[PDB]
Amino acid sequence: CMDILELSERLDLQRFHSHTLSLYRSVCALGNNRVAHALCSHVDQAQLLHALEDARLPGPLRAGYYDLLISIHLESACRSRRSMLSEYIVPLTPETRAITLFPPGRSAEDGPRRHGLPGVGVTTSLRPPHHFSPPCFVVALPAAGATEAPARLSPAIPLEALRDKALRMLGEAVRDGGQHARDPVGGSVEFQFVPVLKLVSTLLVMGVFSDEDVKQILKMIEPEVFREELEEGLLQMKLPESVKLQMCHLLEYFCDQELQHRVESLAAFAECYVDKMQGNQRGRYGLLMKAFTMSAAETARRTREFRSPPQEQINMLLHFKNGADEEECPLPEEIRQELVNFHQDLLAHCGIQLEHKPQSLQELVSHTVVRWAQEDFVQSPELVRAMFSLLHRQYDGLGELLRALPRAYTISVSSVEDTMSLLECLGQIRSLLIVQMGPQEENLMIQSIGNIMNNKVFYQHPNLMRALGMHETVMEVMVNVLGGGESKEIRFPKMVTSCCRFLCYFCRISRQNQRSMFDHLSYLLENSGIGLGMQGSTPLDVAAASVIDNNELALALQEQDLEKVVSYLAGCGLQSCPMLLAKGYPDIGWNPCGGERYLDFLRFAVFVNGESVEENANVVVRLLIRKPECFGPALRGEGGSGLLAAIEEAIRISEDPARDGPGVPPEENRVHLGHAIMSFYAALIDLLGRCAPETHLIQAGKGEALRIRAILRSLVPLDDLVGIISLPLQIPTLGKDGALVQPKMSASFVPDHKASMVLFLDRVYGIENQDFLLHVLDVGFLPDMRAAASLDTATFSTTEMALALNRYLCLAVLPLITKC
Amino acid sequence: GVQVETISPGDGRTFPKRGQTCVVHYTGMLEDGKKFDSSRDRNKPFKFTLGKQEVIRGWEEGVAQMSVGQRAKLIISSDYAYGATGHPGIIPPHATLVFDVELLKLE
Amino acid sequence: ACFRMTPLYNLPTHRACNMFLESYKASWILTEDHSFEDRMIDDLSKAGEQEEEEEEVEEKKPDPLHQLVLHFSRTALTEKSKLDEDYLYMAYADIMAKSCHLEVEVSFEEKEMEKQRLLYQQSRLHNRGAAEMVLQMISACKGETGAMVSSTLKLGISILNGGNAEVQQKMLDYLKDKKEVGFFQSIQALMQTCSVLDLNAFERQNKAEGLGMVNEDGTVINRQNGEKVMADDEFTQDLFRFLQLLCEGHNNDFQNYLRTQTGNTTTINIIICTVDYLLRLQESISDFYWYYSGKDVIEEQGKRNFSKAMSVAKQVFNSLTEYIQGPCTGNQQSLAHSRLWDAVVGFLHVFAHMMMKLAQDSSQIELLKEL
Amino acid sequence: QATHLRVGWALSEGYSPYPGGGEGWGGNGVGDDLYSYGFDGLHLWTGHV
Amino acid sequence: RLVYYEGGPVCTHARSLWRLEPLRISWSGSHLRWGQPLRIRHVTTGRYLGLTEDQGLVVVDASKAHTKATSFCFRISKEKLDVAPKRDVEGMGPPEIKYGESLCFVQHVASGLWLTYAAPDPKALRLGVLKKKAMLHQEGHMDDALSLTRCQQEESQAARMIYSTAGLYNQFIKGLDSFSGKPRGSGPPAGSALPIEGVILSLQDLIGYFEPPSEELQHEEKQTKLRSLRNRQSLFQEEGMLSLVLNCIDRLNVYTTAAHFAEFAGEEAAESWKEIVNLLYELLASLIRGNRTNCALFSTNLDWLVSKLDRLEASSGILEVLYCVLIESPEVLNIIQENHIKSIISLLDKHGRNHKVLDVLCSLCVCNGVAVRSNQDLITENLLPGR
C-alpha cells in the first residue's frame, strides 16, 4: 500500500484509478441502487467524506470522488425530484392561503420593489419525499424470489452533515479564490470549484438545504443583491467556463424557485378570489329568486348566466379587464378592484409593470449573462445555451408563467395522500424510461400501473393526469419495448397488456383523455403491425378505445390511418401467420386472426353510437374494394367459393383435427383455424353491414348512399346470408350418464357468427316482403328460437351455448322480427 | 457454526435476551482479511433485535453468546453467513466471514 | 336548462380554482401586451468595454447577439438525421423577427426615414450572420414542416422585408459558395407538403360543427378543433412570401438561381414547383366552386375557406410576378413552357362563374371584392 | 480503525517502518516484517502475520 | 449478372453507378451525342452491360465485352431514323444530351432492341420484390426513357476504389486458401504467391482514406468532413468491403503466430503477417468508427470479436474495434452476455491495468443515456468482489 496522494506523481496509477471511479459511477448509473449499495462496501462513507475535504488530492481524483459520492448517494433522488420539479400541484391548505407574491414589508405589504429572497419561504407544491436505506452488509438477505422484492433504495448518507460540509467547502473555495494562491485545491480553479458547485447544486435541487443554508448560498453568489434587510461573490471572480456553467445551474435553480413562488401565489389568490366570486353569485341568485320578477324577460336574461356552464360563468364574471357594466359582468366593483390590484402586483413581480447595481435576481442574471458574453467569446456551447436560456427567462417573465401554468393544478386537502402515492408511482414509471426493460423493470412497471389504476385521484382528476403526461410516459415505455426487436417476437407481453389496461382505460375515463390519446393514433397504428399472439390487450386496442363512440373523433379520423389499417388487413389476407406456422399450424395461406383484429378496429371507426359514419364508411368500402384481398380468399372474384361455401369448409376444418390445429394450449389449444376463419368472415360481414348507408339517406335518395349499398349487395349475395343463418348450431346434450356434451365455443360455429349475417341482412338488404320474412323465419330464425327455448331446462339453462343463443336472439333476431 | 473469541472482556453478567435490541459496533472482513463493512466507518452504532431474523444466523448466535461491553471476534461459516448465494458484488459465494464486534449496549 | 341550472357557487373549491386559473390565464395574462424584443436586441447588440478588452486585432470578438446567432448556426450545421424542436431557438427567432418592425398620407421624407429605420434594424441581424443562419436552418429542416421551419421562414421574411438587397446578396453568396442541394431540396419538399382546399375535410368539419352539446362546455370539446381545411395556409403564405422576397427588387441573379443552380450537382426549378402548387390550388378552388355551384348562397364557413384559398393564391401570384419581373427572360420562358396556362384557364373559368354567382347576393360583396 | 499497540524486539539493521504506507495495508509496527517480533496481548506478530 | 430497376436506398449506393465509354480513345470525353455507340461499364464490378444469346441483357466480363454484345446508344425517340449515319469529330463536339433534363432511350446497336423492364412476374409483389428485372425488347414501353444523373466525385472515386480493393483482397484470400492446409515442410510455400506489398499499401491507403477529421477544425468544416466520412463508410459497407476484411482476418487468424504462418506460407511472407493483421484490424476500426449501421452488424457475430481479445499479435487493435462497436451500437449492448463480460475482465487479468479496458466496461453499462441493468450487475458481480 501507499498514500493515495502519491498518485500526483504516479500518473499511470492515477489514470487507472480515475477510470476505476468512472467505472463505479457507470455500474451504479441511472438508478441501480443495488449496485450503489454494493459500492458502499468498496468506497465507504468515511472514505468519501475524507476525499471531499482532501486538499492535496489530484484534480482528477477529487472530481472522480465528488462524482462518485453524487452517483452513489444523491443521483437517483436528485433525478426523481427534478422530474417532479416542473409541475405545481398546490394543495388548498392554510399554508397555501398564506402565500403572497411579495413579502409583507413596511414599504409595501404587496407590490414593493423588493422581492423576497429566491428559494426562501413557504412552498406548498407537492413533491414526494426522498427514500433511502442504510448501508449494511450483515442483515439477513431476503429469501423472497428475485424480480418480486421491492426495488432497493439509494444508500443513505447523513444529509445534515453533508450539507454543512458542502457549505463550508464552498465558502473556503470562495475565500481561496479571493486570495489567488498558486496551489489551488485540485491543481486548478476548475478542479477546486466545479466539484463543490456540483455537490451544492445537487443538494439544492434535492431540496435538503434549509432557509439559512439557502441564504448563505445566495450571499456567496452575490453579497449585495441578496443581502438581508467576502464582499465579492462568485458571479464576479473571473472564473473559467465550467465554473460559469455550474453558476448557471445554480441561477437556473433559483429562477425555477421564483417561478414556483409566482405559481403558488397565483393559486392562493385564485382560492380567495374564487371563494368571493362564489359567495357573490350565491347572494345574487338569492336576490333574483326573492325578487318579484316583474319582467319575465329580465328574469330569463338574469338566469342565462346561472344556466350557463360553470367555465363560461367564470369567463363572463372575469371579462372586465377593459371595463364593463353591471350587465355584461355583474361582479361588484370591489371584487373587480381586488383582481385589478392582484394583476398589477403580478406584473410588478414579473417586472412587466413599468441602476449600476442589479438589486434583483432578474437584473442580476441579465447583467451577469450580458457581461460574460461581452467579456469573452464563449467557447462552450452548453454554457452559451444555458446563459441565453437564463437571459430569455429574465426578459420574458410573464411568458414563463404563462407557459408554466398549464402544469399547475389545485387540489383539496383530502386528496393529498392519494396524490402523493400517485406521484410516487409516476416517479417510478418515469425512472423506468432510462433503463432497458428486463424482468425486474417489467414487474415494477406492472405494479406501478396497478397502483395508479387503483388510486382514486386517477379517476377524479383526469386533467391532472393529462397535465402530468402519464399517458405519454406509459406509451413511451410501451413503444420502447415494442420497437426493441420489432421483427423478433416482442418480449414482456404482460407489460404490453398492462400498457393498454392503463392507457386503454385512460381513453375511457374522460372525453379529453380520449382526444389526447387519439392525437397519437398514427403512432399506435404504426406500432400495431403485430400482436394477436399477445392473447391480451394491444396497441390496436388502444387505437380502438381512442375513437370508440366519439362522433367528433370518428369524423376527425384520417384516410391515411384508414389506409394503413386496410394495408395491414390486406397483408393478413395474403400471408399466413409466421407465429402459427412456427407453432406448427397448417398453412392455409392467410391470417384470419389478425384480419379479425383489423376488421374490429375498422368497425369501431365506421360505426358510432348505433349509427354509421358515412364518410368513414365510404372511405373504408373504397379501400376494401381497391384491395380485394382484404375480403379473404372466399370472396375472391375469380376462384372464390363464396361466403356460404367458406363457412361450410371452415366447419369441416373445425370437425377435422390436423387441419384445425397443430395436432401434435394455454387457452383452448391457442387458436382453432376453423373458428378463426368463421370469425374473420363474421367480422368482415359485420364491418360491411355497419358501412351500409342509413335508411334516411336511402329515402332521400343520395347517389353516394345508393352506390355504396349497390356495391355491398354485389359483394355479399342474399342467398349466402340466408344459408349461413340457416346453418345448424351444435346444442348441448346429455350423453353417457349425465355427461353434459357441450360444444367448444372457441372452436365451433357459434351464434355470434350468425349475428353479423343478421346485421348485414337487416342493414343492406332489409326485410320488406312478407314472403321473404316467412322464408327466412322458417329456415333460419325459428329453428334457433326453438333450440333456445328447448335449452331452458335447469340443466342447460346456463350453458355457454344457451347463453350465446339468448344473446343472439335478443340482439339480432328478435329486434328484427319486432321491426318487421 | 459461529466461533466467538474474546478480544476485550465485558461485564460477564449481562447477556442479550430474545426481544432485546443489541447496539453494537462491528467491522467485517473476509477470511483472507479483506474488509467489506464497518459501522465505525459510518460513525453510527448498528442496532438489531434478537430473534427477529434481522441479521445473519452467525451474528444472532455470536452476539447472543457475547456480553455487554465485550469486544469479540466472530468467525462465521458460509452456512451461518450468506451461504452459496453470497452478497452479489460484496461477498463471494461460499465465504467465511470474520467480524470484530463490540456489544455497546442493550435496549 | 332551468331544470339543470348548474351554478358556479355549488362547484367544489378546487375545481373552481382550476377553472379560474384557466380563465385568468386566457383573458388577463395572455391578453397582456409586453414588448421586450427591441430592448433585448439592443442590449445584446451593445458591446461593452472594448477599450478594456483592447481588441486592436482586426478580428473583433463577437458581441452577445453575434454569439447567439453563431450558436444557432452551429446547431443548424451539426450533422443529424432530423432537426430537433428547439424552444430556445424558436423564441429567439421570434424575438429577432419582431425586432424588425416593418411599420393618411405620409411624406416622401417620412417614407424614406421609415425605410432607413427598417434597413438599420435588419442590418443589426444580417451583420451577425442571421441570413446564413436562416438558410442553414431551412436546409437542416430537411423538408419537414413544423414550428422550427415556420419560425425560420418568419425570421427570413423579417430580415428580407422591403427587398433587402444586402441580405439577398449575402444569401445568394452563401448558397453559391456552399453549393449544397439540401436547401432547395428542403424548399421543394415543403412546397409539396403545402396543402390546398379539401372538400372531404370541409364536409367532415361541417358534420362536426353540426354535432351539438348536451353537457357542460368544459366537459365537451365545443367542436373548436383546429381548422381542417387549409390548416397550414399561414405557413404556405410565409413560404411563398420568402421566395418572393428573395427576388424582390428584380434581383436578376437570384431570379436565375431559383430556376437553375449551375454549380450544384443537381438543380431544382423552384419556378416550376411554384407553378405546380398553383395548379393544385386552382384545381382545389374549381372543385370548391363546383361544390357550391348548385347552392343559392355560400354559407359563412364556405366563404371563409374561399377567402383563405384566395389569399394563398394571391401570394402565389405575387411570387410568380416577382420571379419574372425585371424581366428575367429565362423565368419568362420557363413559365411560358410550364403548365401555367392551364392554371390561368381554370382560374378564368372560376372567376367568370363566381363573379356572376356572387353578384346576385349583396351578403357576399366582400368575397366578390376579394375575388 | 482499532488502536495499534505492540511491544517486542527488533533488529537494528532491517527494522525501518516509515510513516504511511508499507506492507499489507500499512500501519506497520513491531512484527510487521521479519526483523521484529511483537506481542499485542492476544497474538504473536512476525512477518505481518 | 442481372440488371434491375430499383428505387430504394440503392439510389445512393455504389452498385447503381455506371461509366459511359465511347468506342474510341481519342476525345472519349467529348460531349455525348444521340446515336453515338458506347459501352456501359459497372464501376464497382468492372462488368459491361451487354446482350447474350442465352441470357439476354446481362453484365459480362471485359474479356467477353466485344462491341456487338456491349455496344449501346442513346436515342431521343424510338422512331426508325438510325438510317442516318454519323461521323467522328476531333473535338468536344456539339452538346446534345443534358444531365437531368434529357430523356434518352437506350438501344442495343447490333440488334436494335430497346432497354425496358420485364413484365412484372407474379407473386413478386407478395415476396416484396420492389425491383423489376431489366430486359431488351423489340418494342419496349412508352416510359422506357432514362434520365442521366451526375454523381459526386467522391462517390465515383469510392466506387473505383471499391472495385480495385475488392479485386486485390479477393486475390489475397485466394492466395491464402491455396496453401490453407498444405504444410511446406522445408520446401517452397506450395501455393500461389501472395500480394503482400500491394495488400499492405492498400490497407495503409484505406486507413488514411477513412481517417477521422482532426478535432482542431472549425465546426462547419468538421461537420462536412464527418458527413463525407459516414457516406464513404456506408458505401464501402454496402459494397461489402467489411465482409471482405473480416474474411481476410479469419484466414490470417487461422494461424496463431508468425512462425506458424511461415510453416505454410514461407518465411518471407510470414515477415509481414503481424503487420497485415494489425493493419486489417485498424482498417476495420476505421470502417466502423462512429457509424451506427456498421457497428450494429456485430450484434450477430459478437463472439467473433470477443473470442479474439486474447490474441497477442493485435491486442490493442482488437480492443479498439470492440470499443468502437460498444460505443456506437446499443444493439450489441443488448446481446452482451456473462461470458463476454468475463472475457473482457480476463483481459484486465492477463494484460495488466489498462484504462481502455475500463472504458470498454464503462461503455457496456450505459449507451445514449439508457442503462443496461444486466450488464451493470454482471460487471459488478464478476469484477468487484474479488478485490
Numbering used by the authors:
A (entry chain A): 1648 to 1876, 1923 to 2047, 2089 to 2398, 2411 to 2566
B (entry chain E): 2 to 108
C (entry chain A): 3635 to 3737, 3752 to 4019
D (entry chain A): 679 to 727
E (entry chain A): 244 to 630
Q: What did the article's authors report about this structure?
A:
Improved resolutions were obtained for the RyR1 structure without simvastatin: ~2.4 Å global and ~2.2 Å local resolution at the pore for the closed conformation (N = 224,439 particles) as well as ~3.2 Å global and ~2.9 Å local resolution at the pore for the open conformation (N = 26,588 particles).
RyR1 is the primary Ca2+ release channel of the sarcoplasmic reticulum (SR) in skeletal muscle, where SR Ca2+ release plays a crucial role in triggering muscle contractions. Using cryogenic electron microscopy (cryo-EM), previous structural studies revealed the homotetrameric architecture of the 2.3 MDa RyR1 channels exhibiting a mushroom-like shape that consists of a huge cytosolic shell (head) and a C-terminal pore region (stalk) spanning the SR membrane. To solve the structure of simvastatin binding sites on RyR1, we chromatographically purified endogenous RyR1 channels from mouse skeletal muscle tissues.
